[PDB]
Amino acid sequence: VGRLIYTAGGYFRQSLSYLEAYNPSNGSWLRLADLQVPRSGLAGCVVGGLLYAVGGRNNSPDGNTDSSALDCYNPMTNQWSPCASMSVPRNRIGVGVIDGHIYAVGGSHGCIHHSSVERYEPERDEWHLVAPMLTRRIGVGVAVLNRLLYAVGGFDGTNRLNSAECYYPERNEWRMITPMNTIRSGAGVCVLHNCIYAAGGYDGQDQLNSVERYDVETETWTFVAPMRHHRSALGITVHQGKIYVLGGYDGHTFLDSVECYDPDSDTWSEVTRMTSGRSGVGVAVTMEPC
Numbered sequence: 001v002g003r004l005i006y007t008a009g010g011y012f013r014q015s016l017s018y019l020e021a022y023n024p025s026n027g028s029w030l031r032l033a034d035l036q037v038p039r040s041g042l043a044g045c046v047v048g049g050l051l052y053a054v055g056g057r058n059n060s061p062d063g064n065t066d067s068s069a070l071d072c073y074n075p076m077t078n079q080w081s082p083c084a085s086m087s088v089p090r091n092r093i094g095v096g097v098i099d100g101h102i103y104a105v106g107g108s109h110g111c112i113h114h115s116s117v118e119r120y121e122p123e124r125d126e127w128h129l130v131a132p133m134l135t136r137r138i139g140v141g142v143a144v145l146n147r148l149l150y151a152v153g154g155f156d157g158t159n160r161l162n163s164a165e166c167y168y169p170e171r172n173e174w175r176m177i178t179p180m181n182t183i184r185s186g187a188g189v190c191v192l193h194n195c196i197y198a199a200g201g202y203d204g205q206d207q208l209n210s211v212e213r214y215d216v217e218t219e220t221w222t223f224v225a226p227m228r229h230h231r232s233a234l235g236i237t238v239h240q241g242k243i244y245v246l247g248g249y250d251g252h253t254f255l256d257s258v259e260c261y262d263p264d265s266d267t268w269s270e271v272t273r274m275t276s277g278r279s280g281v282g283v284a285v286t287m288e289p290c
């Protein structure tokens with residue numbers, strides 16, 4: 001039928017309500033129904049053809065509000081619907097999906113940096129807390145491989161982190177994994193084939209263009225080719241077995257650049273520009289809308 005890359009929210013001068021879909025098959029962008037509430041620092045994901053937007057923060061002239069919200073976008077209707085809210089607001093959140101369930105990981109609520117993690121069940125419209133991570137992480141990368149959830153990098157309130165850890169659902173327990181070779185907060189983190197990728201991010205001084213990947217069989221991290229643009233607070237998704245990175249911040253500009261990674265050639269190329277530069281978007285892939 002055809003799959004699109006949906007980018008929801010983000011930040012340019014203030015938090016944004018935009019939802020836009022990119023079609024790699026033809027290069028087009030579609031503006032769709034705005035989020036009910038502007039938000040940056042959110043995550044996107046998909047379950048059962050439905051797009052969800054999780055956490056973030058509304059940075060606005062009228063005040064600044066960390067989000068506990070879960071909202072659901074149905075491509076068939078072009079309408080956003082509220083779901084049950086999380087236990088707590090989570091700006092600069094990471095999310096992963098296991099077996100139709102959404103895990104919300106870390107993020108901030110004011111000066112609070114969460115190590116807490118909670119899981120959403122669409123069939124019940126219900127969040128429940130699970131075991132907290134071993135580390136407080138905001139700007140955290142989250143991915144799922146072989147039905148295990150990984151929390152990668154971030155900021156713990158004092159240091160940006162090269163550490164990463166793994167949640168084993170049937171044990172309801174987090175264990176540390178090999179740290180990355182690079183301190184990265186607000187990196188893009190995703191899975192492709194057997195590896196967990198961490199692209200770009202922030203280390204307290206610089207925005208990064210480097211990219212490394214974790215092979216679960218070998219438990220080691222290896223650098224691949226770097227992105228064309230240094231970027232923090234980027235969005236990342238996979239589409240037809242290629243990585244796409246969307247927007248972010250390079251120390252200078254809120255990027256409109258979109259790049260994709262070809263694992264076979266180990267090369268990055270510009271694939272498009274977003275309609276406008278922005279950081280802290282939520283990205284996920286699903287069906288084209290009615």
Ligand SMILES: Cc1cc([C@H](CC(=O)O)c2ccc3c(c2)nnn3C)ccc1Cl
Nearest residue numbers: 041092139155160185186202232233280
């Ligand atoms: C908005 C955002 C910020 C972050 C992190 C937080 C931190 O690690 O403190 C950050 C902060 C400040 C940054 C930066 C990145 N990149 N450049 N600058 C100045 C990570 C993810 C997201 Cl969605």
